[PDB]
Design a protein around this ligand. Structure first.
Ligand SMILES: C[C@H](CCC(=O)O)[C@H]1CC[C@H]2[C@@H]3[C@H](O)C[C@@H]4C[C@H](O)CC[C@]4(C)[C@H]3CC[C@]12C
Ligand SMILES: C[C@H](CCC(=O)O)[C@H]1CC[C@H]2[C@@H]3[C@H](O)C[C@@H]4C[C@H](O)CC[C@]4(C)[C@H]3CC[C@]12C
Lengths: 184, 184
């Protein structure tokens, strides 16, 4: 209960304010004592990592349910994964806004990145993963994650504002993302 | 004086708040009466269009000064234009933030788009323009402008936060933009 309420309140606050959002704000919006928040997350760094994992789990659970694992072709599988990301963020704009800030925050621990993958094996190799961002040195993976998230946010913005052409924006954004972030 | 002060104050407000920013806020921050602001811009729509042109002039004046017109190769010329855009936005983050919101606002008049080009012929054909976004139907030009601006903002974000690798981010972002938004 209170853990879920705190994570939901942290999601809204960071979506609105960035990793800077105050624990006090988060605690009151969750209707708990700030000391109670520290019982769940002793530090802002811990809240960042725990919240990132929470949102990442939610997102990937969404992707798992839309995925058809017959599909082996990487581009097609990647299109489906994109479309599920755009859907997720249109359904949950604060989750997207929060995860975008978390993803590029530089407070994510190697432990946490590790923890993400271990929690959804299905994504590792029911796609055969990647071609996406393989060309980049390790140091620039964060930047490529930022580029992906930038493209996706724009695609969301336009689809939300002009729903009659949502599929068109999604398809154009996909093609942009894929050309940006792959090599043949 | 007062026109320039109002345009500067509108730039900060929209960068912070979006096309929604209030004229009252803009007028006080410019230290003029709100009725005085209406003498310069009778409507928020007019302020949007006049401000967009103001920022667009500033940006393109920057580009004109960095441009070497010996360069005929479109990709190289486009790289230079990108690098000058990234520089401009790092030098003037509110100008970038404001122009990004204006560019996609749907309040820009055909008259204004017309007015932009007429004001800088040098950009029309000392580059031979485009290859950029030529593939898109007219209805999606705004979306492609949004994609460009999304890529550029990210490239700025990373260059500002990690100046030691600024050129690297700029070059990677360029290549992403160019692959997204051209076809051979
Ligand atoms: C699951 C697929 C990999 C499969 C493929 O390339 O086909 C990942 C490839 C790019 C990732 C996304 C990309 O790295 C940007 C974000 C990074 C953030 O840490 C997680 C959410 C992200 C939005 C993330 C979610 C997982 C995908 C969408
Ligand atoms: C001047 C060059 C065209 C030349 C070329 O393709 O080599 C334009 C191609 C893309 C444009 C940019 C792109 O359309 C996105 C923004 C749109 C906004 O209305 C003006 C600023 C913009 C940031 C704009 C400024 C002019 C360039 C940078």
């Amino acid at each position: 209960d209170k853990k879920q309420a705190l994570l939901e309140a942290a999601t809204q606050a960071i979506a609105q304010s960035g990793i800077a959002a105050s624990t006090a704000v988060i605690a009151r919006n969750a209707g708990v004592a700030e000391g109670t928040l520290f019982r769940y997350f002793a530090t802002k760094d811990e809240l960042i990592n725990t919240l990132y994992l929470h949102l990442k789990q939610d997102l990937c659970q969404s992707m798992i349910m839309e995925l058809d694992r017959s599909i082996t072709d990487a581009k097609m599988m990647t299109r489906f994964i994109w479309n599920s990301y755009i859907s997720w963020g249109l359904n949950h704009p604060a989750r997207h806004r929060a995860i975008r800030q978390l993803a590029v925050s530089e407070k994510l621990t190697k432990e946490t990145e590790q923890r993400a993958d271990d929690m959804f094996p299905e994504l590792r190799d029911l796609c055969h993963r990647s071609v996406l961002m393989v060309f980049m040195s390790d140091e620039y993976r964060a930047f490529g994650d930022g580029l992906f998230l930038a493209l996706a946010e724009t695609t969301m913005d336009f689809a939300a504002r002009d729903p009659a052409r949502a599929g068109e924006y999604i398809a154009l954004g996909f093609e942009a993302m894929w050309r940006a972030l792959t090599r043949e």
